[PDB]
């Protein structure tokens, strides 16, 4: 039962973003010419929003509920699949595989992930996806 499909929450087990949560936006089950191994384009979050409680000002809540995101290619060996699923409509034409040869495109893709991560987090679902892992 092939389960590594877009919308599948994963944990990054290696690299700079180790222990960070991410959601798959594209999977390549058979490696291309440049990457012989199977891999996946993923977009995750770097800095989780801080714990927000009542009795705080609206400015403080809005300032502490900010997300910084990342986008990267990973190995299935370096990814750990969970059982949760997050269905956030990332735009494919901006979040895609040719983005890594231009920093401006990379920044646009990161911003595009960030804005809708903010939107869903403020809606308040996928709280497991948005609260950090305690390891």
């Amino acid at each position: 039962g092939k389960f590594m499909k877009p919308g599948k929450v994963v944990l990054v087990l290696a690299g700079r973003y180790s222990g960070r949560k991410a959601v798959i936006v594209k999977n390549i089950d058979d490696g291309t010419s440049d990457r012989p191994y199977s891999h996946a384009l993923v977009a995750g979050i770097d800095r989780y929003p801080r714990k927000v409680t009542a009795a705080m000002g609206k400015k403080k809540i809005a300032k502490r509920s900010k997300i910084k995101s990342f986008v990267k290619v990973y190995n299935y060996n370096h990814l750990m699949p969970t059982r949760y699923s997050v269905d956030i409509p990332l735009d494919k034409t901006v979040v895609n595989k040719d983005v890594f040869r231009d920093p401006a495109l990379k920044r646009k893709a990161r911003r595009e992930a960030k804005v809708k991560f903010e939107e869903r987090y403020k809606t308040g679902k996928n709280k497991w996806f948005f609260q950090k892992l305690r390891f």
Binding site: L13, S18, M80, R83, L133, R134, F135
Partner: protein
């Protein structure tokens, strides 16, 4: 041959009194007093026997002069625990929490049944 002497008032072959030979621009052979060989940090996991990588191996009080990038690596637990045990810790925490959720839901199901 030219056989030479110490340069300090310590005349015993102790740990601090270690020297090497060097030929000076005056065409002479002298002792220089070397520094004690430092060690890279050992992993905080307490299991891996090897040293950490990407961290300079110097005598501990020299680490004040180094910059931060030459002291750690860009990762969670960077420069304090090795990558293998980092990834096993991540996996262990996640799977343990999943098992805890499973046992909680089974307990709730049993409470409903009873």
């Amino acid at each position: 041959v030219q056989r030479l002497t110490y340069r300090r008032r310590l005349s015993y072959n102790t740990a601090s009194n270690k020297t090497r030979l060097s030929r000076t621009p005056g065409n002479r052979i002298v002792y220089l007093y070397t520094k004690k060989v430092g060690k890279a940090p050992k992993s905080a996991c307490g299991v891996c026997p090897g040293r950490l990588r990407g961290v300079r191996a110097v005598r501990p009080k020299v680490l004040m002069r180094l910059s931060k990038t030459k002291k750690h690596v860009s990762r969670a637990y960077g420069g304090s625990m090795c990558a293998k045990c980092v990834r096993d810790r991540i996996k262990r925490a996640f799977l343990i929490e999943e098992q805890k959720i499973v046992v909680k839901v089974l307990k709730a199901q049993a409470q409903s049944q009873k």
